[PDB]
Each structure stands twice: as C-alpha cells, then as structure tokens.
Amino acid sequence: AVKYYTLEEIQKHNNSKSTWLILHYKVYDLTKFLEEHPGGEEVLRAQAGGDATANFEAVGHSTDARELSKTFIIGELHPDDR
Ligand code: HEM
Numbered sequence: 001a002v003k004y005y006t007l008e009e010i011q012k013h014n015n016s017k018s019t020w021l022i023l024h025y026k027v028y029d030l031t032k033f034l035e036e037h038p039g040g041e042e043v044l045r046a047q048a049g050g051d052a053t054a055n056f057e058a059v060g061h062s063t064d065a066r067e068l069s070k071t072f073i074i075g076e077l078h079p080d081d082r
Helices: 007-012 041-047 053-058 063-072
Strands: 018-023 026-029 073-077
Touching: 007 018, 018 041, 018 053, 026 063, 063 073
Parallel strands: none
Antiparallel strands: 018 026, 026 073
C-alpha cells in the first residue's frame, strides 16, 4: 500500500517544520533527517517542495542511502501530478 500526495501539498512541506521533496515521483520525509544528513540540511531544504531526482542521482548516494530513503518514503506523487 502507499498514500498518494499532491504536489500542492508537497510544496507546503518545504522547510524546517516539514522537509519533503519528490525523488523518482515519491515523497521522502527528511524532516527528522535534516540534522543527520551529512550533506547538510540546506542542500535538501533548498530543493524541498520540488523534485530533487537529478541532485540525488548527481550525488550518487550509496545503495545503503537509497535503501535508507525507503524508511522516509511517506507516499507517492499523486498521479494527477505525474
Ligand atoms: C532521499 C533521501 C536521502 C537520503 C536517505 C540521503 C542520505 C545521504 C547519505 C547517507 C549521505 C552520505 C553519502 C553515502 O555514503 O552514500 C548523503 C550525502 C549527501 N547528500 Fe543525501 N540523502 C537524501 C537526499 C538528498 C537530497 C534531496 C539532496 C539535496 C539535493 C542530497 C544531497 C547530498 C549531498 C550534497 C551529500 C554530500 C556528498 C559529499 O559528501 O560531497 N541528499 N546523503
């Protein structure tokens, strides 16, 4: 199962209270990951509300990181937005 969230909504979740972004048309809550993320908070938060696939892939991110991302998958991008 998965919950679908609208890009509208995701754009509201783009700051300290909620840092969510699209990667590969899925919604990753990194809100409680800001401090943890070795790349720093601002790098995600800058793209948050938007898609960051290109950045995520440009950075490579280890298999383990990709796997860890699943732990933050809170939903998919709504098909209306896809
Ligand atoms: C999907 C959620 C993400 C997870 C779980 C995650 C996890 C990690 C981890 C564990 C590292 C260490 C690199 C490694 O060992 O593979 C890292 C580095 C990094 N991440 Fe992420 N990341 C995520 C999303 C993003 C996003 C959206 C961006 C910002 C556009 C980003 C930018 C970076 C940068 C700049 C580094 C540092 C690379 C360096 O050391 O030069 N990450 N991330």
